[PDB]
Each structure stands twice: as C-alpha cells, then as structure tokens.
Amino acid sequence: MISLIAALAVDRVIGMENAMPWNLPADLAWFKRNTLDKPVIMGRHTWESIGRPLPGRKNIILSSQPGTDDRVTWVKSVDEAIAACGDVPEIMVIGGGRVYEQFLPKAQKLYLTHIDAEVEGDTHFPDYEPDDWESVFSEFHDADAQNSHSYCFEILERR
Numbered sequence: 001m002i003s004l005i006a007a008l009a010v011d012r013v014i015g016m017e018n019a020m021p022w023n024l025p026a027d028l029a030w031f032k033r034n035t036l037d038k039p040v041i042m043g044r045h046t047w048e049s050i051g052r053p054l055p056g057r058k059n060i061i062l063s064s065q066p067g068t069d070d071r072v073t074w075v076k077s078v079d080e081a082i083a084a085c086g087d088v089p090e091i092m093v094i095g096g097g098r099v100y101e102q103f104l105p106k107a108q109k110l111y112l113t114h115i116d117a118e119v120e121g122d123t124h125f126p127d128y129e130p131d132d133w134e135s136v137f138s139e140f141h142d143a144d145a146q147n148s149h150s151y152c153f154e155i156l157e158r159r
C-alpha cells in the first residue's frame with residue numbers, strides 16, 4: 001500500500017526555502033511514529049534538506065540524475081521507486097511538492113497534519129478531491145509550550 005504523509009499549513013503550504021517554517025515537535029514525533037520501519041520515498045530536494053538517511057527505514061530518492069551518496073537507494077522514476085520497496089505492507093511517501101503530485105494518484109491513504117499557522121511558501125501540497133477520500137482518523141490539539149499553533153492529525157483512506 002502507498003501512503004503520503006505531510007504537514008499542511010494555511011492554504012496547503014508545505015515548504016519554503018527548502019524548509020517547513022513552523023515548529024511542531026508533536027508533528028515530527030507523529031512522523032517518526034508512522035514512518036518508522038517502512039520504506040520512505042522522497043525527492044532530491046527533500047533529501048538535500050535532511051542530509052542524512054532516516055533511521056530504521058529504507059530511503060529511496062527520485063532523481064532524473066545520477067546518485068551522490070551510497071547510504072541510500074537512488075531511482076529514476078515512480079515505477080522504479082515503488083519496485084525498489086519490494087513487497088512491503090505500506091510505503092511512505094514523505095515526498096516533496098512534486099513527489100506528492102506524482103504519487104497522490106496511486107495513494108491509498110493520506111496522513112495529514114493540518115497546521116493552524118499562516119506562513120507563505122513556494123511549495124504546496126497537491127489539490128486533492130476531498131470527495132473521494134474518507135476520514136478515518138482525526139485528532140485536534142490546542143497550542144502548548146512546545147507547539148505554538150493548534151493542529152490536527154488526520155488520516156484519510158481513498159474510497
């Protein structure tokens with residue numbers, strides 16, 4: 001099964017200057033939790049942003065271009081990336097703007113962290129049809145000392 005996991009701020013903004021503006025440790029904890037032990041797929045930019053493999057997970061990187069680090073698996077297409085994962089229960093696309101657009105069509109579930117923060121960005125999450133998605137999990141959280149905004153963890157499974 002393929003899955004997208006992401007954090008959308010106001011107006012589906014997900015990144016800016018190769019970084020998630022807000023600071024919500026609750027979110028990352030939630031990322032770590034739902035990605036742990038599962039193949040994860042991302043774009044070259046998103047790789048350049050983390051700089052070091054994500055631990056206890058197979059890291060696949062989509063790049064039309066050759067491979068610059070061997071601590072990870074490089075692939076040149078979406079088909080090549082899913083195949084690179086082998087036959088596993090769930091595949092986590094921690095994607096990237098463009099990586100989400102290509103994978104959304106094959107996704108069976110979406111892990112969305114909706115952030116009540118309004119920052120500007122140069123990268124958005126694909127504009128998906130809510131109609132053809134079911135809400136199976138949704139937990140709201142007020143802002144606290146560690147997290148300055150209110151957020152909601154949401155899990156959608158394609159109908």
Ligand SMILES: NC(=O)C1=CN([C@@H]2O[C@H](COP(=O)(O)OP(=O)(O)OC[C@H]3O[C@@H](n4cnc5c(N)ncnc54)[C@H](OP(=O)(O)O)[C@@H]3O)[C@@H](O)[C@H]2O)C=CC1
Nearest residue numbers: 006007015016018019043044045046063064096097098099
């Ligand atoms: N808030 C969240 O949950 C998330 C936020 N982000 C944020 O998103 C932004 C980065 O997003 P974005 O710019 O869209 O980039 P990506 O990380 O998705 O990288 C896209 C790149 O990977 C390669 N690529 C993508 N698809 C293919 C394909 N089918 N075949 C071959 N190569 C492919 C290309 O690089 P090449 O030129 O080498 O081919 C392309 O430019 C940052 O701001 C980051 O912080 C990222 C993930 C989750």
Ligand SMILES: N=C(N)NC(=N)SCc1cccc(C(F)(F)F)c1
Nearest residue numbers: 005006007027028031050054094113
């Ligand atoms: N709930 C979410 N944030 N979903 C994501 N898709 S966040 C994806 C990500 C981008 C850069 C660094 C990280 C790491 F630091 F947590 F590894 C994670």
Ligand SMILES: [Mn+2]
Nearest residue numbers: 134157158159
């Ligand atoms: Mn159904």
